[PDB]
Amino acid sequence: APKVIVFISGSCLFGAISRSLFKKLPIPYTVVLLILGAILGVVASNVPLVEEHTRDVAHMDPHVLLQIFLPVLIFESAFAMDVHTFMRSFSQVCILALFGLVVASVLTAVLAMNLFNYNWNFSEAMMFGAIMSATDPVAVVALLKDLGASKQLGTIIEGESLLNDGCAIVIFNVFMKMVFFPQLTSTVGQNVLYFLQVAVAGPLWGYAVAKVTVFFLSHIFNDALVEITITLAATYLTYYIGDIWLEVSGVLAVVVLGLIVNAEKTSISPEVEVFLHRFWEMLAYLANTLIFMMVGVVVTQKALVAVDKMDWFYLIILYLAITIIRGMVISLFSPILSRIGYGLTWRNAVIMTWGGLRGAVGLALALVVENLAGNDVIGSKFLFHTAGIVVLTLVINATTIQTLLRILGMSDISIPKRLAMAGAVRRIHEGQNRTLNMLKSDRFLADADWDIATAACEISDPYSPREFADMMEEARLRMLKAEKISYWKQFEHGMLAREALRLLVQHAEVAADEKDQFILVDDLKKSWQIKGIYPWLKRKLEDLISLIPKLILVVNGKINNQLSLGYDVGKGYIIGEEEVGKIIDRMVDNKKILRELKHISETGRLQVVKELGLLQREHPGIAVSVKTRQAIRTILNHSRETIHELQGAGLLDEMEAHKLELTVEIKMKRLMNAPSSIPPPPP
Amino acid sequence: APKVIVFISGSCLFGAISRSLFKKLPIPYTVVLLILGAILGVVASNVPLVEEHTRDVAHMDPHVLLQIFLPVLIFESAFAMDVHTFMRSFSQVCILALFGLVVASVLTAVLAMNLFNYNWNFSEAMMFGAIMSATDPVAVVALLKDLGASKQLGTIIEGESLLNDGCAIVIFNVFMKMVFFPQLTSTVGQNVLYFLQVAVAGPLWGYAVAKVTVFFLSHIFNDALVEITITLAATYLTYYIGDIWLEVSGVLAVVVLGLIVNAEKTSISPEVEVFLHRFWEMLAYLANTLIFMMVGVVVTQKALVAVDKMDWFYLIILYLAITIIRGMVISLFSPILSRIGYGLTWRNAVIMTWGGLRGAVGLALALVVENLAGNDVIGSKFLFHTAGIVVLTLVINATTIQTLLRILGMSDISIPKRLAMAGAVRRIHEGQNRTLNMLKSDRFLADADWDIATAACEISDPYSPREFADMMEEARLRMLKAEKISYWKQFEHGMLAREALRLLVQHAEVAADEKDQFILVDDLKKSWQIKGIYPWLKRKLEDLISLIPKLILVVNGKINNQLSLGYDVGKGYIIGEEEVGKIIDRMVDNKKILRELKHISETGRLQVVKELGLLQREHPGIAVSVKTRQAIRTILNHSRETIHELQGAGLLDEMEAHKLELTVEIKMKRLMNAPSSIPPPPP
């Protein structure tokens, strides 16, 4: 009879209670989860049966808890990313994560040696800084995505969290294997070979197993269960094979596996995408709950017997030191991120310094370094410092980050957003009023109550000369709002891709950020440009042909992936300009500015149609293949709507319409692995 | 560095390979999974590394594998049921499962005693029968659900599998505690006390923890992870507490918990319903794969060293004898089951006879016996017999049940559903042709390929005087087909409950199976039958009043659910008669039979209207509450459609529309937890 099952179920029930009872309060559920873990630990210190449960579960081996709890949390943090905005901002995020992590660990080691009274070494203080610098701000990025326009800020803080966490586990692991396993004395060349093979074969093995997983997932139809099992087995086997069967740090392998799988899901069916997102979020929630309750039990059992007032004072100075260190790192690396196309303002820098929340990854590393130390006091000091810093950072930084988001003025509602929200509230009020008026003249519902129905069905708003040049700017902003709604309408019909929609709306908003310019061509130059090493290798392999067919198929697939996005962007621009020229007459009443804006739209139309013609001429087979792909996708979606309205006509039951939906889903998954470039037909 | 993770990942990959590769073959994936497990066990018998992995995993404690695997499989087998058709046939399937299981275990014990050469006593042979009588026909249930109108017998065999697993593991645990732990000698009074305590406090504890879990799930809004966590923790804690902390039969507790939670999902949000269904199916697949692979490994490592030709002959005649015994059980219990409302015909009798497929439940119990027997030969003979029965039963019974459903004529597709399918194929073909002609005249995809796209867009055929009185019967069948089409069309609008729609279509099909009678009111008046013990309890407690407030609230909620079901059935019949009277003119040309059929429909409508008037006379306030619920549901559904059409018009962005959808989903869940009877207002 195991006690792991009853401890896991009790931790799950306590986590459910902490999530339910602490929704409105700004203190997160993990703090009261750690408090309940401390209460459970002192109950185990009194009661022998709870002592049996806690010695069965909480006093476990570090390696099994590491290799179980890190893959699920790391894969969820890499699978919840938005890969397009992360990859288009990978430069500043990657250099900030790597350089800020190494200099923050160095500064934390130096300040630990200059402040603490323990007789530690430089490598052990570097290990302590590696544990300290690990972050996991789920609540910060949730609040940042709840305030609207800072989507890029949430993207860069999530990418900083993922890369900082992964490489923090990497540096903690290499210093743990250097210090805690001291029987190996090696040369400089073998050490730099080991560092090179870790830092290369992490993402390399992760990319190899990710492409193997993608190749497996693409050729699977009509069973989501195999896809879920293959994803879970690939993640766990990747981490275990990397971390045990070779010497490669497998953390980066799981990070890049999650990033590549998130760059996929075109192959994965959408119901499996929704299931995998919810399933990995649930697994990470269970892992966080188990890690927090285990570290609460172990902290109140064995880390409480050595704490004194000097340790408390060093903990307070440690909190101030890590805040000052993160502020200094961001302030020192601010010109480097300002040198790139997306710089950061001072409010984003402040909310990134205050956005650092210590995480269950750091608690798991603290548990590993606590149990791996033995009976000496150093592991208890590491665990106590990590628990104190995570409690202080979680409570104070959560409450003050809500306060600072309110104060710094980026949480306010936008005036066109507020107007659109008020219009939607008025529209749903009129819709409910006419629904009530229709329900009044019902032969079954004329006797029904209406005051209770109106009280229940009420939705409140959650958000509570030179003049001629000024109205030119107002007409321009109304025109770009019409552009936004036209782009969203053509996205809604299924004619556009999600990434092309995101590119169009980011081009429209950076056009909106200026005074008297529309969505131009110079910001749209980089859309369809396949220019680079790809056509160079394409013409190299075409000269060599006339594994080489596999290489030219891979190059053709990359060219198809760029060209479909460029084709979608150009055709979406055509559709948007045609629609906004259809509706230019209603909103614009002045003929001069009407002809001016129509001339601007016609110039954009002619340049985009000639560049689309040149795009077709430069690669005929690729263009005809992607337009055949768009045609077959359109007619498959029309057949899907035909099946849906046949179910909505009552002529076909749910089971046979489900069979036909399965047939057209098989057809769309077969359309996913289409041939890359059909040859052009003879006349 | 555990090896359970690498064996779990390897088993998951092997199960994925076996499911993907053998999809077209009629051989199930479990047999080739066990073959791969046997090959891996032979490799472990040779290679020391695979020996270490199989020693770490396959040589596990039986109690930990029981309490890990059995609640998952039992809860998924309970949760995958449709609870309405299970509860309507609960008496028949309960007496069939219980009596057939006990007499099959007795006959298998007697057969083993007079057949096998071992000196087994009666209790070990009863344990052998309890292992041998456990059935898991999942693929049979899927095949019967594929075969059209065989819904009732599929639900009967599914509930038979669930209850057979339940009391089979109950009697297995009782006789295993009798044999393998014989140090306790007990009195007859204490033995019957233990039997009554098990057979009562199993379902009692299951019902108590199920109502606690349901009341917890009803008060949880806008988060899913808490609900998934609560469901999984409730299942694990229920099985562990019942098996260990009490002497409760833990299998029956999880059966009752799964059936009660399946009676709900009115409280659970629909996305959480879909996630819970797919997640429990995935957990059951993982448990089944692990059980089959470990069974193959142990049965080729330690349970194949005592095999001989006499053992093989005994196994073959054991298979023949248990097939004969199950057929004899079905034949002898056919009249008792035929006295009830759904009598089993001989084709359904031999389908349920040949449908008995042994599986993971019996394999896990055989593993428990093989580990508990130690070095004795009894565990080896048990595991070899059970594994051989499972593999040959799966192969032979799967192939012969495919040929049996072909031979018996239950795989024959009905002529009107084939005509409707052909009409749907014609409609989707002409829709494909007209949208192809629409795609012909466009400025975007004019240069695209056409022949390959049209070849890929082919939804093919999946299915490849007195006579004047006889054509009146066909017109009656056509008009009841129109009535059930109207019922499904009312279901499309969102006025009918799922159980009300199922009741209407089963009334429609039992009217279709008769000569000259329509969907009458005599078979329809069972829906609102309030004549029961609940109004008697309500009136006696109201006379006591004028904890019992909670009692009358529970009784009021139960009769509120009954009144809601009856009112939905009556209103659905009224709206269906109004619709079929609106469309009676087109499909009827003869005026005399037109007036006759319209008179029948009008008399039925008047009868239903007057008895619903009597029904709302009986309980005014509960009728007010249910029509208030109907009005609130209609207004919120129109609000959801208004948000969806603001999204479809592009006026509202995706995240604010998701926030509004979350708001109306919260209001719908609050409508689910409404007061069951609002008091009527004074005039």
CB neighbour class for B464 (10 Å; exposed up to 12, middle 13-18, buried from 19): exposed
- How far apart are alpha carbons B453 and B190 in whole angstroms? 76
B422 is a domain residue: no
Q: Are residues A401 and A254 in the same domain?
A: yes
Residues 6+ apart with CB under 8 A from B337: B92, B95, B96, B343, B344
CB B376 within 8 A of CB B305: no
Q: Rg (Cα) of chain B, in Å, rounded?
A: 29
Q: Which stretches of A500-617 are assigned E, i.e. beta strand? A: none
Give the gap in angstroms from C-alpha B437 to the nearest C-alpha of chain A: 11
Query: Helix A62-79 vs helix A224-240: angle between axes, to the nearest 10 degrees?
Result: 130
Contacts of A635 in chain B (CB under 8 A): 432, 435-436, 439, 453, 457
The domain boundary, picked from B382, B407, B432, lies at B407
Give the gap in angstroms from C-alpha B644 to the nearest C-alpha of chain A: 11
Residue B455 touches partner A, C-beta closer than 8 Å: no
Q: Compare CB distances from B632 to A282, A431, A456 and report the shortest one's residue.
A: A456
Q: Compare CB distances from A285 to B225, B485, B678 and report the shortest one's residue.
A: B225
Q: What backbone torsions phi and psi does residue A412 show, to the nearest 5 degrees?
A: -75, 155
Q: Please work out, in degrees rounded to the nearest 5, the angle formed at the alpha carbon of residue A327 by the alpha carbons of A322 and A332.
A: 125
Cβ–Cβ below 8 Å for A233 and B9: yes
Cβ–Cβ below 8 Å for B244 and A1: yes
Residues 6+ apart with CB under 8 A from A248: A197, A198, A201, A202, A205, A242
Q: Mutate which of B3, B5, B608, B664 to test chain A, going by most A C-beta atoms within 10 A?
A: B5
Cβ–Cβ below 8 Å for B638 and A452: no
Short-list A572, A578, A586, CA closest to A602:
A578
- How far apart are alpha carbons A572 and B442 in whole angstroms? 15
- How far apart are alpha carbons B458 and A122 in whole angstroms? 70
CB neighbour class for A257 (10 Å; exposed up to 12, middle 13-18, buried from 19): buried
Short-list B167, B196, B177, B179, CA closest to B104:
B167
Short-list A605, A422, A636, CA closest to A524:
A605
Short-list B547, B477, B556, CA closest to B514:
B477
CB A560 within 8 A of CB A544: no
Cβ–Cβ below 8 Å for B627 and A447: yes
3-state secondary structure (DSSP) of residue A506: helix
Query: What is the total count of domains within chain A?
Result: 2
Q: Please work out, in degrees rounded to the nearest 5, the angle formed at the alpha carbon of residue B654 by the alpha carbons of B653 and B657.
A: 85
CB B649 within 8 A of CB A579: no
CB B130 within 8 A of CB B365: yes
Q: Are residues B627 and B498 in the same domain?
A: yes
- How far apart are alpha carbons A425 and A421 in whole angstroms? 6
Give Cα A253 distance to the centre of its chain: 17
The distance in angstroms from the start CA to the end CA of chain B is: 76
Q: Which helix (H) or strand (E) holds A458?
A: none
Q: Are residues A428 and A399 in the same domain?
A: no
Short-list A96, A24, A14, A635, CA closest to A338:
A96
Residue A630 touches partner B, C-beta closer than 8 Å: yes
Q: Are residues A328 and A432 in the same domain?
A: no
CB A457 within 8 A of CB B636: yes
A36 is a domain residue: yes
Q: Compare CB distances from B428 to A5, A286, A639 and report the shortest one's residue.
A: A639
- How far apart are alpha carbons A553 and A556 in whole angstroms? 5
Secondary structure in 3-state letters for A339-403: CCCCCCCHHHHHHHHCCCCCCHHHHHHHHHHHHCCCCCHHHHHHHHHHHHHHHHHHHHHHHHHHH
CB B51 within 8 A of CB B45: yes
- How far apart are alpha carbons A66 and A71 in whole angstroms? 8
- How far apart are alpha carbons A34 and A358 in whole angstroms? 14
CB B256 within 8 A of CB B206: yes
Q: Mutate which of A144, A216, A225 to test chain B, going by most B C-beta atoms within 10 A?
A: A225
Residues A521-551: b if buried by 16+ CB within 10 A, e if exposed = eeebeebbebeeeeeebbeebeeeeeeeeee
Short-list A587, A611, A591, A609, CA closest to A599:
A591
In this structure, what CATH number is given to the domain that contains residue B277?
Answer: 1.20.1530.20
Q: Please work out, in degrees rounded to the nearest 5, the angle formed at the alpha carbon of residue A521 by the alpha carbons of A517 and A522.
A: 90
Contacts of A649 in chain B (CB under 8 A): 489
The domain boundary, picked from B385, B407, B429, lies at B407
Contacts of A17 in chain B (CB under 8 A): none
Contacts of B435 in chain A (CB under 8 A): 634-635, 638-639
Q: Which helix (H) or strand (E) holds A522?
A: none
Q: Which helix (H) or strand (E) holds B535?
A: helix B533-545
Q: Which helix (H) or strand (E) holds A623?
A: helix A620-647
Return the amino acid letter for B627: K
- How far apart are alpha carbons B296 and B290 in whole angstroms? 10
Cβ–Cβ below 8 Å for B6 and A240: yes
- How far apart are alpha carbons A202 and A216 in whole angstroms? 21
Give the gap in angstroms from C-alpha A451 to the nearest C-alpha of chain B: 10
Short-list A169, A144, A173, A146, CA closest to A158:
A144
**Residue in the structure block whose two tokens are 């006025």:** B495
Q: Measured between alpha carbons, how far is residue B542 from residues B537, B553, B556, B615, B618 in Å?
A: 8, 11, 11, 20, 15
Q: Are residues B547 and B630 in the same domain?
A: yes
Q: Mutate which of B29, B221, B428 to test chain A, going by most A C-beta atoms within 10 A?
A: B428
B563 is a domain residue: yes
B8 to chain A: nearest residue by CA? Answer: A233
Q: Rg (Cα) of chain A, in Å, rounded?
A: 29
B148 to chain A: nearest residue by CA? Answer: A655
CB A394 within 8 A of CB A357: yes
Query: Helix A224-240 vs helix A188-218: angle between axes, to the nearest 10 degrees?
Result: 170
H-type helices in B583-649, by residue range? 584-587, 591-618, 620-648
CB A580 within 8 A of CB A479: yes
- How far apart are alpha carbons B508 and B602 in whole angstroms? 18
Query: Helix B122-132 vs helix B360-373: angle between axes, to the nearest 10 degrees?
Result: 150
Within 10 angstroms of residue B86's Cβ, the number of other Cβ atoms is 20
B492 is a domain residue: yes
Return the amino acid letter for A617: R
The domain boundary, picked from B352, B376, B407, lies at B407
Residue B632 touches partner A, C-beta closer than 8 Å: yes
A494 sits in the region (left: phi over 0; alpha: psi -120 to 50; else beta) called left
- How far apart are alpha carbons A662 and A657 in whole angstroms? 8
Within 10 angstroms of residue A372's Cβ, the number of other Cβ atoms is 15
Q: Are residues B192 and B327 in the same domain?
A: yes
Q: Are residues A448 and A366 in the same domain?
A: no
Cβ–Cβ below 8 Å for B2 and A67: yes
Q: Are residues A419 and A403 in the same domain?
A: no
- How far apart are alpha carbons B252 and B248 in whole angstroms? 9
- How far apart are alpha carbons A441 and A443 in whole angstroms? 7
Q: Are residues A357 and A403 in the same domain?
A: yes
Residue B236 touches partner A, C-beta closer than 8 Å: yes
Residues composing chain B = 683
Tokens of residue B71, six digits: 């609640």
Residue B659 touches partner A, C-beta closer than 8 Å: yes
- How far apart are alpha carbons A289 and A291 in whole angstroms? 6
Q: What's the DSSP call for residue B27?
A: S
Q: Compare CB distances from B453 to A631, A656, A660 and report the shortest one's residue.
A: A631
Contacts of A485 in chain B (CB under 8 A): 650-651
Its sign, for the CA torsion B79, B84, B90, B96, is negative
- How far apart are alpha carbons B577 and B612 in whole angstroms? 15
B648 to chain A: nearest residue by CA? Answer: A492
CB A265 within 8 A of CB A50: no
- How far apart are alpha carbons A229 and A217 in whole angstroms? 11
Query: Helix B122-132 vs helix B377-407: angle between axes, to the nearest 10 degrees?
Result: 40
- How far apart are alpha carbons B302 and B367 in whole angstroms? 11
CB B372 within 8 A of CB B114: no
Q: Compare CB distances from A457 to B225, B279, B639 and report the shortest one's residue.
A: B639
Find residues 347-386 of chain A whose CB sits inside 8 Å of chain B: none
Find residues 67-106 of chain B whose CB sits inside 8 Å of chain A: 67-68
Query: Helix A62-79 vs helix A360-371: angle between axes, to the nearest 10 degrees?
Result: 170
- How far apart are alpha carbons A348 and B179 in whole angstroms? 71
Residue A673 touches partner B, C-beta closer than 8 Å: no
Short-list B402, B388, B308, B393, CA closest to B35:
B388
- How far apart are alpha carbons A576 and A483 in whole angstroms? 6
CB A132 within 8 A of CB A116: no
Tokens of residue B206, six digits: 């299951």
Q: What's the DSSP call for residue B181?
A: S
Q: Mutate which of A632, A669, A678 to test chain B, going by most B C-beta atoms within 10 A?
A: A632
Query: Helix A466-492 vs helix A498-512: angle between axes, to the nearest 10 degrees?
Result: 170
- How far apart are alpha carbons B473 and B471 in whole angstroms? 5
Give Cα B267 distance to the centre of its chain: 19
CB A383 within 8 A of CB A298: yes
A11 is a domain residue: yes
A47 sits in the region (left: phi over 0; alpha: psi -120 to 50; else beta) called beta
If you write DSSP's letter for every residue of B295-348 in order, what string do you get? HHHHHHHTSSSS--HHHHHHHHHHHHHHHHHHHHHHHHHHHHHHHSSSPPPHHH
CB B258 within 8 A of CB B75: yes
B228 to chain A: nearest residue by CA? Answer: A282
Secondary structure in 3-state letters for A245-268: HCCCCHHHHHHHHHHHHHHCCCCC
- How far apart are alpha carbons B353 and B357 in whole angstroms? 10
CB B393 within 8 A of CB B358: yes
Q: Compare CB distances from B447 to A224, A624, A656 and report the shortest one's residue.
A: A624
If you write DSSP's letter for every residue of A139-205 in order, what string do you get? HHHHHHHHTSS-HHHHHHHHHHHHHHHHHHHHHHHHHHHHHTSTT----HHHHHHHHHHHHHHHHHH
Tokens of residue A260, six digits: 């590549």
3-state secondary structure (DSSP) of residue B247: coil
B455 is a domain residue: no
Cβ–Cβ below 8 Å for B428 and A660: yes
Q: Mutate which of B225, B279, B489, B580 to test chain A, going by most A C-beta atoms within 10 A?
A: B225
Residues 6+ apart with CB under 8 A from A529: A566
Short-list B659, A477, A510, CA closest to A485:
A477
Residue B420 touches partner A, C-beta closer than 8 Å: yes
Residue B331 touches partner A, C-beta closer than 8 Å: no
Q: Please work out, in degrees rounded to the nearest 5, the angle formed at the alpha carbon of residue A390 by the alpha carbons of A389 and A391.
A: 90
Find residues 560-619 of chain A whose CB sits inside 8 Å of chain B: 571, 616
- How far apart are alpha carbons B435 and A635 in whole angstroms? 7
B335 is a domain residue: yes
CB A245 within 8 A of CB A294: no
Residue A505 touches partner B, C-beta closer than 8 Å: no
Q: Are residues A16 and A101 in the same domain?
A: yes
3-state secondary structure (DSSP) of residue A120: coil
CB B452 within 8 A of CB A631: no
Short-list B78, B248, B64, B98, CA closest to B173:
B248
Q: Measured between alpha carbons, how far is residue B90 from residues B83, B158, B249 in Å?
A: 10, 11, 20
Give the gap in angstroms from C-alpha A1 to the nearest C-alpha of chain B: 6
Q: Please work out, in degrees rounded to the nearest 5, the angle formed at the alpha carbon of residue A450 by the alpha carbons of A446 and A451.
A: 160
Q: What's the DSSP call for residue A242?
A: I
Contacts of A639 in chain B (CB under 8 A): 428, 431-432, 435, 457, 459
Cβ–Cβ below 8 Å for B5 and A68: yes
Q: Are residues B368 and B489 in the same domain?
A: no
CB A290 within 8 A of CB A362: no
Residue A422 touches partner B, C-beta closer than 8 Å: no
Residues B127-156: b if buried by 16+ CB within 10 A, e if exposed = bbbbbbbbbbbbbbbebbeebeebbbbbbb
- How far apart are alpha carbons A308 and A118 in whole angstroms? 13
CB B53 within 8 A of CB B294: no
Tokens of residue B120, six digits: 């087994």
Q: Please work out, in degrees rounded to the nearest 5, the angle formed at the alpha carbon of residue B58 by the alpha carbons of B54 and B64.
A: 145
- How far apart are alpha carbons A240 and B455 in whole angstroms? 46
Q: Are residues A350 and A372 in the same domain?
A: yes
Domain, as residue range, for B217: 4-407
Cβ–Cβ below 8 Å for B12 and A230: yes
Short-list B397, B502, B446, CA closest to B85:
B502
Within 10 angstroms of residue A6's Cβ, the number of other Cβ atoms is 20
Resolution attained, angstroms: 3.8
Q: What's the DSSP call for residue B530?
A: -
CB B131 within 8 A of CB B386: yes
Q: Please work out, in degrees rounded to the nearest 5, the angle formed at the alpha carbon of residue A271 by the alpha carbons of A266 and A274.
A: 90
Tokens of residue B172, six digits: 């297995």
- How far apart are alpha carbons B259 and B151 in whole angstroms? 19
- How far apart are alpha carbons A555 and A218 in whole angstroms? 19
- How far apart are alpha carbons A303 and A382 in whole angstroms? 9
Return the amino acid letter for A608: V
A464 is a domain residue: no
Q: What backbone torsions phi and psi does residue B341 show, to the nearest 5 degrees?
A: -65, -25
- How far apart are alpha carbons B384 and A353 in whole angstroms? 64
- How far apart are alpha carbons A266 and A255 in whole angstroms? 19
- How far apart are alpha carbons B128 and B133 in whole angstroms? 9
- How far apart are alpha carbons A477 and A482 in whole angstroms? 9
Q: Please work out, in degrees rounded to the nearest 5, the angle formed at the alpha carbon of residue B627 by the alpha carbons of B626 and B630.
A: 90
Give Cα B476 distance to the centre of its chain: 33
CB A564 within 8 A of CB A588: no
CB A313 within 8 A of CB A307: no
